[PDB]
Amino acid sequence: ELMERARNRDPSGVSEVIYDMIAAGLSPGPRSFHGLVVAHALNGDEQGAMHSLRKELGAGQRPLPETMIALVRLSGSKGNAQRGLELLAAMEKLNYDIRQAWLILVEELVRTNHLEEANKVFLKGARGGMRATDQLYDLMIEEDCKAGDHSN
Amino acid sequence: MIDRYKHQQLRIGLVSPQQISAWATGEVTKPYTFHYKTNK
C-alpha cells in the first residue's frame, strides 16, 4: 500500500502509511522510507526529499542506493549542483559506488541546461579518478564547443 | 594523444614616437652626467 501511494505521487499518504507501521509495531525499514523519498522527489520537492533523508538518518536506518540516486537526480534536475555533491559525499561515506550517481547528476545537469555546473561536476569526478562513458565524453565535448567554451 | 599545445611568440617591430614617449613617461635635456664635486 505504501509503494502504491508512492507511485501516485502522494508523499502525505506515504507518511500516513509510515505512521500506521509505527502504530502497528512494524519498524520502518529502508524500503518504506525509500518509497517516501521517491514520492517526495517525483513531484519536484527537494526540501521534502531531504527531510525524508533526515528522517532516514534519525531513524537509524541505512539509506538504499536508490534513495541517494533519486536525491542526486532531483538535485541535478533542479540544478542544485552543491546538493548533489553533498549527496555524493554522503554516498562515499556510506561505502557506495558513486560513479553511476555522478554520471546521472552530470547528465541531468546537462539536460536542464546548467552547462557550467555540469562541467564543474564532471571535472571534479574526472580529476577524482572516475571514468565516464564514451557517450558522456562526446556530449560534454560537443556541448562545450557549441557553447564556445574551449577551456572546459 | 592530444599534443600539449604551447603557443608562445615574440615579435620585433619598428617603434613609433608615441611608444617611445610611453616608454619614457621623462625627457633627457642636459648633457651633464655627474657632479664633478658632489658626485651626484
Binding site: L53, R54, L57, G58, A59, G60, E86, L87, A89, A90, K93, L94 | D3, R4, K6
Partner: peptide, 17 residues
C-alpha cells in the same frame, strides 16, 4: 628531451537512541 610536449549530511543526524 625532458622538455618535449611541455614536459555535511550524516553528521548532526545520527540515531538518537
Amino acid at each position: 628531451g625532458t622538455g618535449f610536449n611541455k614536459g555535511d549530511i550524516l553528521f548532526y543526524h545520527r540515531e538518537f537512541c
